[PDB]
Amino acid sequence: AMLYLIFYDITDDNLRNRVAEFLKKKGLDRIQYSVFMGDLNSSRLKDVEAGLKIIGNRKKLQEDERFFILIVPITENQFRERIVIGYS
Amino acid sequence: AMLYLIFYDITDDNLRNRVAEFLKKKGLDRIQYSVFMGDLNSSRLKDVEAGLKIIGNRKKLQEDERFFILIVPITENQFRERIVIGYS
């Protein structure tokens, strides 16, 4: 299994909570309000993709609404080399 | 230079626009409302980190406010293997 980083930008609170709940249930580690990470083999990755697509199987309602999920393979080393910036 | 993915979750519109403007000026490619990518050597990465920290050199004002920036090294292959999910 490769490791994946999953980031999302979902303006609708209910859809956003649905995504967070789904990703938690599939076993991914939450690392920020809208970021998860974890290992996914082919089967589990397919299941994740398919379920996220169901949550997104919607039309947008207001022009400023966003629903975006990016899933990218990374390595544990790359993650250890991350830079995180927050409020001072 | 390594490639980097930069994701952010910034609830304050003015700080968010300041970050987007800064990253555009430093030459990164915008790939989503709150995501950029591009190559950064040591010097340029340091300059990016330092400027983002200045924008974040704030205290939080409301409990729901967020300011989070994640910078992660990735490869062009990993990026080509990304999965993107939006509205159907």
Contact predicate A22/A55, CB 8 Å = yes
Q: Are A9 and A34 in contact (CB under 8 A)?
A: yes
Q: What is the C-alpha to C-alpha distance for residues B2 and B42, in angstroms, rounded to an integer? A: 9
Residue at A79 is within a domain: no
- Experimental approach: X-ray
Q: Is residue B60 part of a domain?
A: yes
Beta strands, E only, chain B? 2-10, 29-32, 35-40, 67-74, 83-85
Residues of chain B contacting A, Cβ within 8 Å: 5, 7, 9, 32-35, 45, 49, 52-53, 56-60, 66-74, 78-79, 81-88
Question: At what resolution in Å was this solved?
Answer: 1.6
Q: Which residues of B touch A84 (CB under 8 A)?
A: 68-71
DSSP B28: P
Report how many domains make up chain A: 1
- Token representation of residue A23: 């990703």
Residue A9 belongs to domain with CATH number: 3.30.70.240
Integer Cα distance of A29 and A24 in angstroms: 7
Residue B80 within a domain: no
**Helix and strand numbers, DSSP H then E, in chain A:** 3, 5
Residue B70 in any domain: the answer is: yes
Q: Which of A32, A22, A16, A7 is nearest to A65 (CA)?
A: A16
Establish if B19 belongs to a structural domain. yes
> What chain A residue is nearest to B60 in terms of C-alpha separation?
A87
Whether residues B74 and A69 touch (CB distance < 8 A) is answered with: no
Contact B88 A56 (CB under 8 A): yes
Asked whether residue B46 is domain-assigned, the answer is yes
The verdict on residue A31 lying in a domain is: yes
Q: Which of B53, B19, B48, B49 is nearest to B33 (CA)?
A: B19
Domain encompassing residue B6: 1-74
A58 to each of A15, A66, A70, B51, how far by Cα in Å? 10, 11, 18, 38
Q: Is residue A87 part of a domain?
A: no
